[PDB]
Amino acid sequence: SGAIYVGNYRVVNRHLATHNDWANLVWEDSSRDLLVSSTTAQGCDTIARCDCQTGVYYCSSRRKHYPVSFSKPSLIFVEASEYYPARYQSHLMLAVGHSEPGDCGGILRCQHGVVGIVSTGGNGLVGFADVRDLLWLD
Ligand SMILES: NC(=O)[C@H]1CCCN(C(=O)[C@H]2SCCc3sccc32)C1
Numbered sequence: 064s065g066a067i068y069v070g071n072y073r074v075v076n077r078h079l080a081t082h083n084d085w086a087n088l089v090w091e092d093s094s095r096d097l098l099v100s101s102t103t104a105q106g107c108d109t110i111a112r113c114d115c116q117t118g119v120y121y122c123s124s125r126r127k128h129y130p131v132s133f134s135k136p137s138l139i140f141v142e143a144s145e146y147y148p149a150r151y152q153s154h155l156m157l158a159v160g161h162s163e164p165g166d167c168g169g170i171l172r173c174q175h176g177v178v179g180i181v182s183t184g185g186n187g188l189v190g191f192a193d194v195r196d197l198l199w200l201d
């Protein structure tokens with residue numbers, strides 16, 4: 064679990080969005096596994112606007128942060144799950160690092176701010192949904 068809080072927006076994994084997220088919907092994209100809802104309170108986070116390919120992510124299944132080198136956002140095949148059919152997920156970045164189901168929502172950050180959130184993984188890989196191109200979040 065986890066979310067980004069920036070301005071009057073809350074960014075979450077679309078597959079973990081709540082009834083309240085959907086009732087306050089701003090934008091969603093199944094191909095990216097992202098949903099953004101509106102909030103009444105002002106956020107705590109800053110979004111990176113950069114081309115970093117290294118950073119640090121939070122891994123809830125280890126209660127720890129890990130450094131990672133990650134690929135540029137791209138179209139990657141993701142196997143079927145209970146949440147989605149087999150499909151290509153866009154704007155996804157892969158890295159070698161531990162992840163297991165429950166770690167989705169963990170934040171990836173570089174020196175500039177928040178880069179994205181955990182969205183996929185398995186077998187020593189971790190995938191992050193990029194948010195740096197969503198300029199309107201600011
Ligand atoms: N973006 C998606 O389509 C997700 C939806 C939830 C399931 N999923 C995962 O990758 C899970 S099952 C494999 C082990 C791990 S490790 C962190 C997540 C997962 C794909």
Ligand SMILES: [Zn+2]
Nearest residue numbers: 113115173175
């Ligand atoms: Zn950066």
